[PDB]
Amino acid sequence: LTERLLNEENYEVYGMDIGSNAISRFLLHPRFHFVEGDISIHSEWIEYHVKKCDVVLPLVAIATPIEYTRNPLRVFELDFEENLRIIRYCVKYRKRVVFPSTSEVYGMCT
Amino acid sequence: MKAVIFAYHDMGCQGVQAVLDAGYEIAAIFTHADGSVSRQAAELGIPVYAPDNVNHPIWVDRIAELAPDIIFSFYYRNLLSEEILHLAPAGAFNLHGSLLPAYRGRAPLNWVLVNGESETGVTLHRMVKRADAGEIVASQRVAIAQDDVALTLHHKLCQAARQLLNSILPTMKCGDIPSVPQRESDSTYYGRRRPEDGLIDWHKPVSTVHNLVRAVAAPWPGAFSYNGSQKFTIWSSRMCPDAQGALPGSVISVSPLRVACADGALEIITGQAGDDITVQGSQLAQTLGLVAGARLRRIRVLILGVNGFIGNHLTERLLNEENYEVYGMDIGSNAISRFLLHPRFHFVEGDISIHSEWIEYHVKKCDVVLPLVAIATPIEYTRNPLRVFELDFEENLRIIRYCVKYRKRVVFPSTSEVYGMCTDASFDEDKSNLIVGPVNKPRWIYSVSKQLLDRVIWAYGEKEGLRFTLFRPFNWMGPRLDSLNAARIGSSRAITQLILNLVEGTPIKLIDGGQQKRCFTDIRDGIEALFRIIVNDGDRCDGKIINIGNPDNEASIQELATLLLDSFDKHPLRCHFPPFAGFQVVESRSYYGKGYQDVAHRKPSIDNARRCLGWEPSIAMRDTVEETLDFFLRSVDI
Amino acid sequence: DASFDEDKSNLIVGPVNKPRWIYSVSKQLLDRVIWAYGEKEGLRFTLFRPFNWMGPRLDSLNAARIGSSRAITQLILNLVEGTPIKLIDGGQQKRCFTDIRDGIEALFRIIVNDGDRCDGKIINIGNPDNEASIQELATLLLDSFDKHPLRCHFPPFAGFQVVESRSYYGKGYQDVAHRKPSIDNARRCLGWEPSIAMRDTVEETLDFFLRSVDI
Amino acid sequence: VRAVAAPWPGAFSYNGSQKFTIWSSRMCPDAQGALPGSVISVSPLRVACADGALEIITGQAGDDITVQGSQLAQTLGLVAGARLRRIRVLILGVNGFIGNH
Numbered sequence A: 001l002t003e004r005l006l007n008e009e010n011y012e013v014y015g016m017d018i019g020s021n022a023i024s025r026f027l028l029h030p031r032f033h034f035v036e037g038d039i040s041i042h043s044e045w046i047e048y049h050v051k052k053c054d055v056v057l058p059l060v061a062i063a064t065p066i067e068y069t070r071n072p073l074r075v076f077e078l079d080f081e082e083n084l085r086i087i088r089y090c091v092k093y094r095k096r097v098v099f100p101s102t103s104e105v106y107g108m109c110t
Numbered sequence B: 001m002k003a004v005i006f007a008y009h010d011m012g013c014q015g016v017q018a019v020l021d022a023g024y025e026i027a028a029i030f031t032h033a034d035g036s037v038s039r040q041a042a043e044l045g046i047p048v049y050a051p052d053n054v055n056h057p058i059w060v061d062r063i064a065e066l067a068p069d070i071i072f073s074f075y076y077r078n079l080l081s082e083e084i085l086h087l088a089p090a091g092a093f094n095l096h097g098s099l100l101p102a103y104r105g106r107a108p109l110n111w112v113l114v115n116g117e118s119e120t121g122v123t124l125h126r127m128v129k130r131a132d133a134g135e136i137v138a139s140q141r142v143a144i145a146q147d148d149v150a151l152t153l154h155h156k157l158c159q160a161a162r163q164l165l166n167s168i169l170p171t172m173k174c175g176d177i178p179s180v181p182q183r184e185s186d187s188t189y190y191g192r193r194r195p196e197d198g199l200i201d202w203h204k205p206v207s208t209v210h211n212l213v214r215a216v217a218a219p220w221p222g223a224f225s226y227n228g229s230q231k232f233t234i235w236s237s238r239m240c241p242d243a244q245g246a247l248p249g250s251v252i253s254v255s256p257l258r259v260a261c262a263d264g265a266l267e268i269i270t271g272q273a274g275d276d277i278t279v280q281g282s283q284l285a286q287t288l289g290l291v292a293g294a295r296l297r298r299i300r301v302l303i304l305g306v307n308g309f310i311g312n313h314l315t316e317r318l319l320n321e322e323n324y325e326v327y328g329m330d331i332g333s334n335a336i337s338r339f340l341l342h343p344r345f346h347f348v349e350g351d352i353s354i355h356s357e358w359i360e361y362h363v364k365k366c367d368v369v370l371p372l373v374a375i376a377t378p379i380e381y382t383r384n385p386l387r388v389f390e391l392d393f394e395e396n397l398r399i400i401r402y403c404v405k406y407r408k409r410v411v412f413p414s415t416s417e418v419y420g421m422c423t424d425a426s427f428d429e430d431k432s433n434l435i436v437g438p439v440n441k442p443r444w445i446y447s448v449s450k451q452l453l454d455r456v457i458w459a460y461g462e463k464e465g466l467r468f469t470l471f472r473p474f475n476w477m478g479p480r481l482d483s484l485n486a487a488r489i490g491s492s493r494a495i496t497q498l499i500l501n502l503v504e505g506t507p508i509k510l511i512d513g514g515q516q517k518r519c520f521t522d523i524r525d526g527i528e529a530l531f532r533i534i535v536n537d538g539d540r541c542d543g544k545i546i547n548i549g550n551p552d553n554e555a556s557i558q559e560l561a562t563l564l565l566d567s568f569d570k571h572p573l574r575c576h577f578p579p580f581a582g583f584q585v586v587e588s589r590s591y592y593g594k595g596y597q598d599v600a601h602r603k604p605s606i607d608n609a610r611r612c613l614g615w616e617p618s619i620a621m622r623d624t625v626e627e628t629l630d631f632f633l634r635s636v637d638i
Numbered sequence C: 001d002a003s004f005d006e007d008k009s010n011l012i013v014g015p016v017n018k019p020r021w022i023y024s025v026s027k028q029l030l031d032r033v034i035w036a037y038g039e040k041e042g043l044r045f046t047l048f049r050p051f052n053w054m055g056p057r058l059d060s061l062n063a064a065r066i067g068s069s070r071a072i073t074q075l076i077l078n079l080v081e082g083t084p085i086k087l088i089d090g091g092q093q094k095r096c097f098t099d100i101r102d103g104i105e106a107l108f109r110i111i112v113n114d115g116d117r118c119d120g121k122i123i124n125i126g127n128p129d130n131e132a133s134i135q136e137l138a139t140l141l142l143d144s145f146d147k148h149p150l151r152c153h154f155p156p157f158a159g160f161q162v163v164e165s166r167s168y169y170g171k172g173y174q175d176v177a178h179r180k181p182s183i184d185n186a187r188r189c190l191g192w193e194p195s196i197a198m199r200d201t202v203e204e205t206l207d208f209f210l211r212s213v214d215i
Numbered sequence D: 001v002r003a004v005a006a007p008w009p010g011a012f013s014y015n016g017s018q019k020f021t022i023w024s025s026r027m028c029p030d031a032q033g034a035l036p037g038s039v040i041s042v043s044p045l046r047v048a049c050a051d052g053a054l055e056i057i058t059g060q061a062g063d064d065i066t067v068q069g070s071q072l073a074q075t076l077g078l079v080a081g082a083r084l085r086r087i088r089v090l091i092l093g094v095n096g097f098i099g100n101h
């Protein structure tokens, strides 16, 4: 998504993560700004940036079927709690969430 | 005769009945917790004890109270102290497994199979202070067959002991010593086997690999290797000389399972793929999915206070080594200007007194944490005791809880002042006591602080699994040790304060006589030892309280200023500075203020640093004073 | 030091691999922080260091079975449930035992603070006239047990037995051999010296804990 | 005692408050007169039941090693003796549908 929006004309993308070991190609791209952050720790840097931006895409999530039974609590505490904190940041500062739901929400649907 | 027997496992099980058969009166059998020796002596109506350490005033002064005549050691795990050996007149004799004086180590019944020995047998000898190096009394040797494995050779050598103690033992009841010393060149003390030793090396002879597999055949850990990333063991094998032109590690057949070695091939009979059941060699290569293949990021160091005494020189050393990503946090970079632009170093803005989020984030991002921020000047202890305690204890402790929570390693900086006014000849991390003055002596608000912090680290690393290593510098000094402009306040260590007195032509004060002695360590030696700890070669540092210091440099502050003055006059800029303002001895409560106290002598036990790092100091006092002087001198408007 | 002086005696503890002193070092650093406040901020304070006080209501018999119990009431438990009186590491070390009444009286005098004599000073409450050993304690304990009007209802005495340190306390323990307080600051500031002798303390402590049990 | 002797968990009881196990025994019919549960002697270690007494051949106190019945009663230290608050319920929402009942 960073490369798509970066190739597009008027997109100033701010990307938060703990590393840059896969986004190395466009790190210094003038329309891309990397920021250091963990959605579990930072409350201010994440809230600041949500104000500064227009759309928010909280792509941080643990989405591995093994981790659900392995680490059920960290799966909940990250996929739910911390992401919801970001969503309340958005309702407060009046921003749009392009939020990622999941296919697993249907579960064993007929 | 009265016999005290230290017996354990199968050997002790048989040896106790061998002594009981030889006519002896048994009045004490000592062993350990859990064929057994405890249930054996229990069902014989014998008194049997199992102490933690038999060398104990409750036990030593109650073993000789039983009036022992002989003491016999049948595979005892703990070592006996000479004071406990000399309790029986006729003496004490340990039955060792190997054919002494060979393999005089521990657990040799495995090592004989490993190397491929042809014969080995029991050897009863007289316990001396040397490790299993007494005088031979009897030796029923046993031959190792081509098929023998661990359990088989165990019961075979066990029969050898049970058979030898039916002859020499009834003869020893009369007080004879038909003993023979050991050629102290014909000795091998093979130590304990660690689990990272039953690993297979396929680039060796099949004889070697088969010898290993037999050495750890059930119920031992068993030889093992890895297909891709699946640890699988090999319980039994067959030395197949068929080379079948294949590279070491390559699978040849799947039924029979055959792996190629440097010469020939090893044929795997049984084994397990993981902790699942032991299976047939073909079924073994099935669950592994074998066909015909072979067999078998840099480190993030977080430095809190990169711009500082240690931090500057530590970042330089970690940086020169290729594979290190150092992240250094500080309020200013006014002295780390040389590597700011260095790609393998990232500076980051922060103060541990304010930031409580960025710290935690970075502790996650890194691999080892070095909270080098700490106010460590004797004057500030009495001046701002609350400031010293809040910064050096409270805030740094919060950094450590970050580490225990995120499972990082803490190379934490303890101090020499943790010992305080210690009497010991050399201050030992693991034995020296810790002496401090009363509460009305606030100079120790620093010492007590770093110590309690030490103990909390200890508690975490022990009750919660914190990876840590404590290092206690001993008066490190060199370039970049405080600043002369901040040394004018008193907030400065000893050396650069006297250098300031030479620069501005102030009398060099020698507090309270100036006759106390300390060991002065060079910066290069201390930074090498710290890096050796950080590399942590083979976990030699985990849980250890190491000690960095240079005992070759014990001098007095008068001796220090003397060596300093002679290097000042010999400097090419002595002319640029005023004439020397002389010495003058002053009260302590005249320069440090009320409530001061001091340690008179200081000598570090670098035993652990020698033992864990393969390091001993080098640069002597003279070189340090010269380089320290030079740097600070030319860093002046000239 | 023969008698521990709050204002002169040093403070000695074993190395870090002796977590017994996690308590001592903790209470001391806290002591020193109070001292700092009292001078760098003017905190009104007074520090009192009890010396093996004992009497009625000292731990519980139910919390003594876990180990969470001081020496006196632990042995009282041993004599209550037919359990041997263990004398850790010989039980031959000595401490000065202060009665509850005297210690409370000294503390009350501290709270009164007659004429600000207690401000900034580290008072020490103890009875140097009651130095005894755990061996000698347990014997004086036993001696008071059998002449008690309820000797009969409790089971027989189970004997004494010496035990290693790291068999009852575990890894990393160490102990202070002798302990005697300098009660000068108490005397000087409180007009206070101890009175009740050990036997009364032993007898009243036992008496209370004994009848505090269902029959 | 036989039904769970080694290497099975083993029978056990309480010496006041310490857990000791009985590995081997001899049901001893000589109903030597004591309360069922009283210790009769040390060597042999005997404890009374309803119809006689049980005799302790071997055993272990705590997890220290197994010994003779005599040594067991010493590590325990025995003579003729005998073997051997309400619940706080917090209700958030006490005034309501379930709570009141």
Ligand SMILES: O=C(O)[C@H]1O[C@H](OP(=O)(O)OP(=O)(O)OC[C@H]2O[C@@H](n3ccc(=O)[nH]c3=O)[C@H](O)[C@@H]2O)[C@H](O)[C@@H](O)[C@@H]1O
Pocket (backbone or CB within 6 Å): B376, B377, B378, B415, B416, B417, B473, B474, B475, B476, B492, B493, B494, B495, B497, B498, B509, B510, B511, B512, B514, B516, B518, B557, B598
């Ligand atoms: O690295 C160490 O071993 C420890 O040493 C220091 O303790 P200290 O040696 O007492 O402090 P110094 O600045 O090195 O002073 C040493 C002695 O020199 C003397 N001195 C110092 C300055 C001066 O102007 N004149 C003078 O006579 C004083 O007696 C002073 O105690 C610090 O307390 C610790 O932070 C440090 O870790």
Ligand SMILES: O=C(O)[C@H]1O[C@H](OP(=O)(O)OP(=O)(O)OC[C@H]2O[C@@H](n3ccc(=O)[nH]c3=O)[C@H](O)[C@@H]2O)[C@H](O)[C@@H](O)[C@@H]1O
Pocket (backbone or CB within 6 Å): C023, C050, C051, C052, C053, C069, C070, C071, C072, C074, C075, C085, C086, C087, C088, C091, C095, C134, C175, C176
């Ligand atoms: O109240 C006090 O003076 C101090 O009591 C304790 O220190 P200590 O007296 O040494 O510990 P105790 O449990 O009261 O017992 C004293 C010693 O008797 C010994 N002991 C204990 C129990 C026992 O059954 N047998 C026995 O010999 C132990 O070695 C123990 O250290 C606490 O550590 C201090 O915090 C407290 O201030």
